[PDB]
Design an enzyme around this catalytic site. Sequence first.
Site, PDB file in Angstrom:
ATOM      1  N   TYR A 473      -9.139   0.669 -18.078  1.00 16.54           N
ATOM      2  CA  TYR A 473      -8.736   1.049 -16.724  1.00 16.54           C
ATOM      3  C   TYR A 473      -9.284   2.479 -16.513  1.00 16.54           C
ATOM      4  CZ  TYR A 473      -5.723   1.891 -12.660  1.00 16.54           C
ATOM      5  OH  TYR A 473      -5.228   2.182 -11.393  1.00 16.54           O
ATOM      6  N   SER A 554      -9.023  -3.141 -10.322  1.00 16.68           N
ATOM      7  CA  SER A 554      -8.675  -2.019  -9.442  1.00 16.68           C
ATOM      8  C   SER A 554      -9.538  -0.802  -9.801  1.00 16.68           C
ATOM      9  CB  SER A 554      -7.156  -1.816  -9.540  1.00 16.68           C
ATOM     10  OG  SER A 554      -6.698  -0.935  -8.538  1.00 16.68           O
ATOM     11  N   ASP A 641      -5.892  -8.526   0.085  1.00 14.31           N
ATOM     12  CA  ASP A 641      -5.847  -7.331  -0.723  1.00 14.31           C
ATOM     13  C   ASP A 641      -5.985  -6.094   0.157  1.00 14.31           C
ATOM     14  OD1 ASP A 641      -5.842  -5.247  -2.447  1.00 14.31           O
ATOM     15  OD2 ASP A 641      -7.348  -6.096  -3.846  1.00 14.31           O
ATOM     16  N   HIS A 680      -3.701  -7.765  -3.900  1.00 14.63           N
ATOM     17  CA  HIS A 680      -4.183  -6.960  -5.012  1.00 14.63           C
ATOM     18  C   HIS A 680      -3.750  -7.510  -6.364  1.00 14.63           C
ATOM     19  CE1 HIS A 680      -6.332  -3.510  -6.385  1.00 14.63           C
ATOM     20  NE2 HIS A 680      -5.285  -3.001  -7.010  1.00 14.63           N
TER      21      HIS A 680
HETATM   22  O1  LIG Z   1      -3.324   1.158  -6.258  1.00 12.05           O
HETATM   23  C1  LIG Z   1      -3.913   2.172  -6.677  1.00 12.05           C
HETATM   24  C2  LIG Z   1      -3.127   3.377  -7.172  1.00 12.05           C
HETATM   25  C3  LIG Z   1      -2.834   3.307  -8.670  1.00 12.05           C
HETATM   26  C4  LIG Z   1      -1.394   3.810  -8.777  1.00 12.05           C
HETATM   27  N1  LIG Z   1      -0.601   3.199  -9.886  1.00 12.05           N
HETATM   28  C5  LIG Z   1      -0.315   1.935 -10.200  1.00 12.05           C
HETATM   29  C6  LIG Z   1       0.478   1.996 -11.326  1.00 12.05           C
HETATM   30  C7  LIG Z   1       1.094   0.920 -12.180  1.00 12.05           C
HETATM   31  C8  LIG Z   1       1.408   1.156 -13.521  1.00 12.05           C
HETATM   32  C9  LIG Z   1       1.972   0.137 -14.302  1.00 12.05           C
HETATM   33  C10 LIG Z   1       2.215  -1.122 -13.739  1.00 12.05           C
HETATM   34  F1  LIG Z   1       2.759  -2.111 -14.475  1.00 12.05           F
HETATM   35  C11 LIG Z   1       1.893  -1.366 -12.404  1.00 12.05           C
HETATM   36  C12 LIG Z   1       1.331  -0.348 -11.632  1.00 12.05           C
HETATM   37  N2  LIG Z   1       0.734   3.275 -11.666  1.00 12.05           N
HETATM   38  N3  LIG Z   1       0.046   4.099 -10.750  1.00 12.05           N
HETATM   39  C13 LIG Z   1      -0.700   3.374  -7.505  1.00 12.05           C
HETATM   40  N4  LIG Z   1      -1.807   3.435  -6.523  1.00 12.05           N
HETATM   41  C14 LIG Z   1      -1.670   3.549  -5.187  1.00 12.05           C
HETATM   42  O2  LIG Z   1      -2.649   3.603  -4.420  1.00 12.05           O
HETATM   43  C15 LIG Z   1      -0.242   3.603  -4.646  1.00 12.05           C
HETATM   44  C16 LIG Z   1      -0.186   3.612  -3.109  1.00 12.05           C
HETATM   45  C17 LIG Z   1       1.140   4.124  -2.517  1.00 12.05           C
HETATM   46  C18 LIG Z   1       1.412   5.598  -2.861  1.00 12.05           C
HETATM   47  C19 LIG Z   1       0.474   6.573  -2.570  1.00 12.05           C
HETATM   48  C20 LIG Z   1       0.723   7.908  -2.882  1.00 12.05           C
HETATM   49  C21 LIG Z   1       1.937   8.265  -3.484  1.00 12.05           C
HETATM   50  C22 LIG Z   1       2.891   7.275  -3.767  1.00 12.05           C
HETATM   51  C23 LIG Z   1       2.625   5.932  -3.435  1.00 12.05           C
HETATM   52  N5  LIG Z   1      -5.239   2.238  -6.711  1.00 12.05           N
HETATM   53  C24 LIG Z   1      -6.044   1.109  -6.225  1.00 12.05           C
HETATM   54  C25 LIG Z   1      -7.466   1.616  -6.389  1.00 12.05           C
HETATM   55  C26 LIG Z   1      -7.333   2.670  -7.504  1.00 12.05           C
HETATM   56  C27 LIG Z   1      -6.006   3.384  -7.232  1.00 12.05           C
END
Ligand SMILES: O=C([C@@H]1C[C@H](n2cc(-c3ccc(F)cc3)nn2)CN1C(=O)CCCc1ccccc1)N1CCCC1
Length: 710
Positions: A473, A554, A641, A680
Site C-alpha cells: 500500500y 487505492s 466508487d 471503493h
Molecule cells: O480513501 C483514501 C484515504 C485513505 C485513508 N484511510 C483509510 C484507512 C483504513 C485503515 C484500515 C482499514 F481497515 C480501513 C481503512 N485509514 N486511512 C482514508 N482516506 C480518505 O480519503 C478519507 C476521506 C474522508 C476524510 C478526509 C479527511 C479527514 C477525515 C476523513 N484514499 C483513497 C485514495 C488514496 C487515499
Amino acid sequence: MLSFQYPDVYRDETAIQDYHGHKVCDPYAWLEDPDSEQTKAFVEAQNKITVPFLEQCPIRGLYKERMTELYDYPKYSCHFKKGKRYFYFYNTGLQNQRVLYVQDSLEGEARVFLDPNILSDDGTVALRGYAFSEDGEYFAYGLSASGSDWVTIKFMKVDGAKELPDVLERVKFSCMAWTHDGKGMFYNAYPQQDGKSDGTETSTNLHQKLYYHVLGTDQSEDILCAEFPDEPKWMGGAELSDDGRYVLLSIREGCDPVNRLWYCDLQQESNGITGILKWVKLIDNFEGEYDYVTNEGTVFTFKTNRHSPNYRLINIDFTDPEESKWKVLVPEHEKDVLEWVACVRSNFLVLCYLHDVKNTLQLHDLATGALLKIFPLEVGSVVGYSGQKKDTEIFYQFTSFLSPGIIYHCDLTKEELEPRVFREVTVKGIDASDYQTVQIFYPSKDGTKIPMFIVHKKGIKLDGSHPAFLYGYGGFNISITPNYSVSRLIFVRHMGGVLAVANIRGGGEYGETWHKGGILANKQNCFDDFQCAAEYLIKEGYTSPKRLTINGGSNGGLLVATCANQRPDLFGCVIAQVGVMDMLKFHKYTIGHAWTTDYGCSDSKQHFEWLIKYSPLHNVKLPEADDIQYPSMLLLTADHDDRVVPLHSLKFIATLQYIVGRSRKQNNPLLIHVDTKAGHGAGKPTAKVIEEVSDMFAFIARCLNIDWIP
Ligand SMILES: O=C([C@@H]1C[C@H](n2cc(-c3ccc(F)cc3)nn2)CN1C(=O)CCCc1ccccc1)N1CCCC1
C-alpha cells in the site's frame, strides 16, 4: 493468447493544459464525465473484452468453487455491551452482509437486531457507521447503497427493535454521537448540490457542517452547531466525553494524523443546544493529533503524536491548558508505535502497540500510566476490541495469516486477570501447520531496511520456480499488518504460490517518520521500496519476474501502476484495484482534495514537478529494449466508487491500450473491469467479493499459465 481487439477510443488531441510552463495533453479527458453516452459506451466496450478473457479458462470455476467452500466459515465480531444488553455481528459464512444480534446476557438466547441482507436482493445495501445512545435504548445507523460513501442515517428503539421515523440525508464522512441526555445526536452533512449524490457523480465535497438532530423531529429542524465558511475543506467531527459533560470537536483538513481540538462544556450553554456552541479553542492549529481517551473532571487524557512520532499519552487539564503544563502519562517508545488506547472499568487503559509490524496488548493504570498486565498474543493483529469506561470486561479479536483467529474475553472485575478464548473458528481445507510465515528486513535503494512478511509452504526449494503474489500500500499512515485471507491461501495451496507483503514507507509501521518517508517529495521512496521487495524475492529464489504478480488497492493501486511503468521487466502480472492514476487531477473530484497531505497538489509548481515524474497516467511509455514489454495488467474499479472516481482507471486503461497495447511486441493483455452496484470496497457483499477474487486469480493463472493443484 490475445483473441480480442482493443476498442477504438477517441483521442481529443486539442485537450492541452499548461502546468507552470509544462504542457500536458489529456486526450481522454472526456472520460471524466461518467454520465455521457461516450463514457458509457467505453465502459461497455471494455467489459465486453475483459469478461470473456477472465471466464474462458476452467481455472476460474475451480478457484470460485474452492473460495466458496473455504470462505464458508462463521465470522463473528467482538461482543459489546450497550446499556442492559449485549450485541455482536455474525455471518453464518456466506451471507452477503454480516448481521447484528442482541442478547440480554452472555448466557442468553440471541436474536436478530438488524439484518442488512433483507434491504436488497443482491446485498448492495450495507451498514456504514452506527451509534447507540448512552443508555443503550436507542440506535442510529448509516446505510450506504451500491458501495457509495453517501449515507442515510436511520433510527431504532432497541426494545422490540422498533423502526422510528427519523431519517437524515446528505450525510458523508460523518460522526455519530448522542448527547447523554438522550435528546439527540450530532452528525455531519454536506450542503445541497446540483446533479446526483448517489456515488456516480464526481462533484467535490466542500463545506461539511456539524448538525444536531433532536430525536422525533424532521431533519429540517436540526441545529447547526459548527461550520467553517472560510475554510471549505475543514471537517469537524463531534464526540461526547465519557461523563457526558463535554462535546469534543476534532477538526481535520486532509488526511494527515493531526487535528484541531475544540471543546464545549454543555453545562455552560445558555439554554441547551440551540445554535453554534460556545466552542473553547483548546488546540487551534493542525500541528498534532489529539485523540480523546478519557477524562476525570477537567483532566483529559489524549493519545498524541505532538513531538512524538511513535505516539504517547498526555494529560491536558482544561483549567491549566498551556503545553508546558501537560503531563506525560505514558511516554513515547523508541521504536514501538502506540496504535490505539481505550479506557475501561473506570481506571484501566488498554494500550495496543505495533512492534515490528505485529500487535501487542497491555493493561495500564489510568492514574499513573504504569503497566499492569500483558495480554499474550501470537504473531498477528488485533482487529477488533470492546470495552468502554463504564464497562467491566474487554473482548478483543486476533487474526493472522494462517488462522481466521480468536476472540478473547477478560473479566476485569477479577483480582487476578486471565484472558480466555471466547470464540474460535477453524477453516477445514487449510491446515495451518503446512505453511510458515517469516519476517525479513531487506535494504531499499537508499539503504533503509524495510520489513516484509513471506508466507509459503514449508520445505519449498528457493529455486525461483514459484509464482508469487506481492502486496503493498505505502501511504496515509496505514500499517499493513497480518490478516487472514482465504483468497490468498488458495493461491498458496492450489496455485503453488508464495505470498509476500512489503511494509514500505508511507505506511504507519514505524510511526510518523515512516509515514513522512513516503509522502510529498519522497513519494518515490514507496515505489523504490516496493521494487526492491520484488528484487529481494527474485534474488533469494522465491520467484522469478515472469512468475511474479504485484497487487495493491487505492493508494496501493497507484503503487502497482507506477511500478509497472518504472520497472516493467520486474513483473509478470499487475492487478491494480481502485487506483489513483491521474496525479494531476485527483484533487478535483469528490474527497480527493483530502489526499494532498500525502501527495501534494499540481497547483503548486514544486508539487507538480514531483507528481509528473510518477503519475501513472503520465508515464506510460513503450519499453526501449526489444525484449521488454509491459506486464499483463488488470485494473478493477466500479461505477459507484466515489472515493477514487473511476475516471482514474478509465483514462489509464485507454492510455495503456493506445501507447502500449498497439505495439507489435506487446502480447500481454491490458484490461479493465468496471463492476456495477459497487464502489471503493467497504460494504461490498460476499457474492461480489467472491467474484472479484475469482477474477484476480483467474487473470494470474491465465497470464502466467499456472496449473491448478487440487
Ligand atoms: O480513501 C483514501 C484515504 C485513505 C485513508 N484511510 C483509510 C484507512 C483504513 C485503515 C484500515 C482499514 F481497515 C480501513 C481503512 N485509514 N486511512 C482514508 N482516506 C480518505 O480519503 C478519507 C476521506 C474522508 C476524510 C478526509 C479527511 C479527514 C477525515 C476523513 N484514499 C483513497 C485514495 C488514496 C487515499
